[model samples]
Target: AEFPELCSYTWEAVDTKNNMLYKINICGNMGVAQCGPSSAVCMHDLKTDSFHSVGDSLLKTASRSLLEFNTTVNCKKIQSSITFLCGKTLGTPEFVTATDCVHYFEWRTTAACKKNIFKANKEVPCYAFDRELKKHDLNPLIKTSGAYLVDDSDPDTSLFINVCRDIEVLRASSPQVRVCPTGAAACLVRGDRAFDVGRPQEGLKLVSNDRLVLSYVKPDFCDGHSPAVTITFVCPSERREGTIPKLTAKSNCRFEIEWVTEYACHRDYLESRSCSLSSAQHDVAVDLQPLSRVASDSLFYTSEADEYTYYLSICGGSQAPICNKKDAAVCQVKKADSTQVKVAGRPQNLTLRYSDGDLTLIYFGGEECSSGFQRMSVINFECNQTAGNNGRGAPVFTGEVDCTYFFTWDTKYACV
Candidate 1:
C-alpha cells in the first residue's frame, strides 16, 4: 500500500482488473508501446535501512500476495506457480495447459483447458519409471536387473523380492538354469513389485492405431508434485476384456474415469508379448537381482540405461550397454542439448547406443555455441558439401551434396 514506506511503486486500477500499471513504469517509454524487445525494464531493487523498501525485502506470500510471471489467461486463488486452485468458478485440474476442475463433493478436481490441453498421453515412459523410484540423498542405489520374487503364501500382504545371485530359478526356460526377470521373455523368476490389473474393463476399444491408453496427472512432469500416473499400455488392434488397473492417478484418482479400468482395449498389459511386468502370472512370488554398477557421475547422462534394449551399435561398439554419455571419450555431447537443441547444416553428429522409449535412431548435435539432442528423420539428409558451422554463418555446404564425405548411416556397398 502506498509503496510500503511511501518510496515509489505502481499498480493497476480496480476497474482494469488485469491491466497492470505503475507511475514509475519505465518499460515501453514509461509503460506504453515498446517494452524494450522484452522485459519492460531492469531496475535495481531499492535498499532501505529500516523501513519497508524493495531491496532485499521479504515479500511475505501469506499476509499479502507475491505476484509472479503470468502463464495463463486466468487466475484468482493466488497460489504459487503450482498446487494453485484458481478461478472463482472452475475446479483445478493438475495437467497444466492453456486452461486450468472439480465437481461433486468427493473433492475431485481436474485441470480445465479450452481442450485436452496436452498433446501426449499420460503413459509413464518405462525409461523413467525406475528413475521415479530413485533414492536421492546419497544413499547407495539398489540397482536391480532381474524379477520380483513375491512370497507365494502372501503375494497380497507381502511381495518380498530381490535379485537372485549365483543361482537360477526359472530352469525350464533356459539351459544355464538362469532366471528371467518376472514377466520377461529372456528370463523369469526375477523380482520387483509387480501388478496384474485388478479390475478388467470389458468391451473397451483402443481408438488409436497403436491401441494404447496413457495416464497423466496435473503438474504433468517429474518434478513439482509428480502426481498419480498410470502404468497401462494397451495395443489397439486387438479387442478384449482385460483387467488393466495401474496404481498411478488414473487408478486411484481423476474424474470421468472409474478409478479402475474405465476403457476397453484389444490387448492390455497382461497381453503384451514383450518382457513386461504385465506378461507374468498374477500373484506369484519372484526374486530380483542387484544390477551391475553404472556410472553415477552425471545423473543426466543416459548412455548406461537399459530400460528397453535397442539393438543399436552407436559409433561402433558391440557390448556392455552403450557407453555412458558422461564417459563418452569417443562420443561427444553437451548434455544440455537433451533439453535445448537445434539443427545445423549437414546433420550434426548424432549419438549412437542411446535409447529412451521410442529408441531414437538419430539426432542433431545442437544450436551454435549452445547444445541439444533433437531426433530427426534418417532421410532428412542427402550429403550437401559447402562448409559452414552453426548460426546463419555457423556451418553450411553452400551447393552440392557430397557423396565422398563421411556421414552417419552412409552405406559403403550398393543396396541389395
Candidate 2:
C-alpha cells in the first residue's frame, strides 16, 4: 500500500517549563527518513505519555541509523548517538527512554523555588540541584569559602566546584557575600579543633604523589575573619605553616590564579618572611600557626586614645591573653574591660549601627555591651571592631565568609 510520510504529521501539542526534553529519530530501507509523528514535535506534557513514529518521506535524505535519541541524562547505559537541543537528530542510540526526569510534582516544586531565589540581584551560578544540596544537612561539607557552578541548561548535569591551583584563581568580586542560600561560601571545617574562625580549605589529594599543573580560583572568605589570611590544606594536616597568597583584582569579574602550594608558602612568608623559603619538601598537608613568643615585627598595631580605638575583649586586671610581636611578655588584655567611652570616669553615650553581620559604633558615650562575638580590634570605622590588621581600622564588609583579622594594640597593655 502506497502511504503518505508520517514525518509531516503532528497531533496535539503541550507546553514544557524548561526546554526541549528529548528527541526521537528513526531510519529505514533505501534510506527512508523522518523526525516525529507530532505537530508540536516532542514537547512534553506531564499528564500523558506520548509517542512519535515516522515513515518514508520521499523528499528527504536517508538517515543511516535507527532508534536514536538526545537527552540530558548521562550514564553508562544510555547512548548519546542521536541527539539535538531537544528532539530530532540521529545516528544510533544505545537506548531511547525516559530514565531520569523531572517528576510532575518535583518539576513544579523545583521551578517555584528557582523563581523565588533569583527574583533579584545575584552573581554566582544557581542550579536546581541546590534544592538537593539544601537537603541532607548540606551533606556536611565545609560551609563557607566554598563554591559551585550550576548546569544552567541540564537537569541531570552535576554541579561542579571547580578549582585550579597554579593558574587563574577566582576570587569574589566583593570581599563579602552571603551563602545562606546558591550560597557561594568560604571558610574551613576544624572538626574537633574548630575555632569558628579561620581560612576555609579547598583541596584535592593525589593518589599518586606526582604533581600536576592547575589553575586556581580564590576561595571565599568565611565570616570568621582572622587576624590574618589563613589557609589549611589537606591532601592531611601538619604543624601549621601559613603565609600571604598574592592578589591582583580586575574589573571584568574574572581574575587570575596561583598554585595552592605557592599560596601556602606566601602565607608562611607573610607571617614571618625572615623564616625560610627555603623550600624542598613533598607530600602531606599543613596549617599555619603563629610563632611562639614575641619575635620581630610582630606588633600588629599600637593604641592611640585620640582615635577611640580600644580593645573590645581585654579582660581588665589579668585574664590576659597573649602579647604582641613587639612585646609578648607583660602585655595582657584588660580585666573587667568593656569597649567604653568615658569622659573623666563617667559613662558617655555610644550609638551603634549594624548591617550584614557587622555593628558600627555610633558611640555617643560609654555604653557597655552585654554580649557579642568574642571581641578583638585595634580601631576606626570597621565591621570587625574599632581597629586591627596593622592599623587599617576595624574589619569592614564582614563579607559573610568564615574569616577574621588580627591586630596587636598597645594601650599601656596589649590585646588582639
Candidate 3:
C-alpha cells in the first residue's frame, strides 16, 4: 500500500499466454462478492464464467521510479513490477510478460512519483508539474492574470483558461450567463450556448516536455465523462517568443491547445542518455555529422559580411582544431579557410540541466572572439523515441547572439 492513492482501485491486465484477464488490487482484495475474501489477485478465463484467485496479501516495495508487489499463490511465486513513466496519467496497467509464475507489468502514472502529491494551499496558485524536478513550477505561459482563450465557437460564448485562477471571457460583449467562476482551470461559458469546465482539483501536470495536461474528476461535466485539456507547446527556435495559445475542441469536453513558443523545445522529461563516449560524470560527447543529411563534419552559418563554418563536437573537441588548443569543443573557422577563425575553444564551465524532463547542455567561458566576446553554446536535445537509422537528424542552428549559439537536435538518442 505504498501508493495509498493507487489503492482501493482494481487494476487489470491481459495475459497473452492463455488469453486470460487478471485483476489485482494492491491494498485490499477484489471481487469480494464473487472471488471471495483474501483475493488480492484474480484471473478470469474468457471462456469460463468465474474468476480464479491467484494471490492473497501482497508484499510491496516502492522506489522513485518503480513499484514491486509480491505474493504467493499455491506455493508458486507471483511478482508484479510497475515502472514509473511520465506522459501517462495513471494509465491502466498493461501486461508485458509472465514467466515462471512472475507477472511483469508497466503502469505509467504520476502516482508513481512520490513527490507529485502536494498539500492544498488556497492562497497560493497551483503551478504545472515538472517531472524532472519531481515538483511544480509557475509556468510562464499560464501564470498570468489574463486567461488564454480556449474556445471561440461564438463571439458571445467562448472558453478561457487561467491555470489555477478564475478567467473572464468575452471582453467586449457581456455574456448571457456566467459559465466560469473562480477556481476553474478551464471554463466553458454556455449562455445557453455550451461550455466545458475542467475540474480545478487536478491542477496541472506535465505529461511530456511539450505536453501539459489538466484532468478533471467525475461529476461528469459533459455528455459522458469528465473533461480534460492538453496544452501542446511547440518550440520554433527561430522565434524568441510565441503567440497566445490557440484552442481546439476534439470531443465532448476534451480540449487541445497549441502554444507555439521557444519554451517548448527541451527534452527534460526523458531519462538522460549515457552517451557511448560519455564520461562517468554524465558528460556526453556526440558528433553532429550523424544528424546532418550529407553527414558533413561541419555546420555552416553566415553573418552579414562573413560566412563561418562551425566545426563542433559536444563534451569534447572538434575534428578540425580551429582553436589554439587541440581539445576545443567549438571551432569557428571562417568559410574561406581554417586560418581566418573568429573563436574556437573548449568551455570552462559545462553543465547539463533539466527542467520538466527537458535536457539542455550548456557551456560558458569558451574561447574569446577577436572582439573579446566569449563564445557559448546551448544545445537542446529533442526526443524522438521512434526515429530510425541511428535516429539523429535535423540539426537546427540559431545564432541567438553574436558569440552565443543555440542548437536543437531531433534524435532518438535523446529518448530513454
Q: Count the backbone clashes (under 3 Å) in each candidate.
A: 50, 78, 7
The count of backbone overlaps in candidate 2 is 78
Candidate 1 lDDT at 163 equals 15
The superposed Cα distance between candidate 1 and the true structure at residue 48, in angstroms, equals: 40
Give me the overall lDDT of model 2: 0.22
**All candidates: TM-score:** 0.16, 0.20, 0.39
Candidates ranked by lDDT: 3, 2, 1
TM-score of 1: 0.16
Best by lDDT: 3
Instruction: Give one digit per residue, the lDDT tens place, for model 1 in 199-277.
Output: 1111112233333333322222224432332223333333233342222322222311121221222112222111112
Q: Put down candidate 3 lDDT per residue, 1-416, tens digits, no spaces.
A: 45564565665567655666767676655564345466666667666657766555446676756666665554437555666543113444656776776667765443453344221111122333233322223333443233566544556646666553334333312353243454455666654643446544544455665454544422244677567766655544342323666776657667777666444543222113322323232233333334323234443222222466565555442344345454555556666665766444354456554433445666555655433335666677778866544575444665655456777766776653
Over 1-416, each residue of candidate 2 has an lDDT whose tens digit, in order, gives 11111122221111233322322222223211223332122333234544322222222222221213333334432222222111110001112233343111101011111122211111111111111111010111211133333222323321223221110013333222221123222222222121111121322222222222222233233333231221222211322332222223211223222223322221122221111112223122111112111224432222323323322311111111233221121122333553322211011222222112121222111211222111122112322233333323322222111111223322211111
- Candidate 2 has a TM-score of 0.20
Which prediction has more favorable lDDT, 2 or 3?
A: 3
Off by over 4 Å in 1: 1-118, 121-349, 354-361, 365-416
Greater TM-score among 1 and 2 belongs to 2
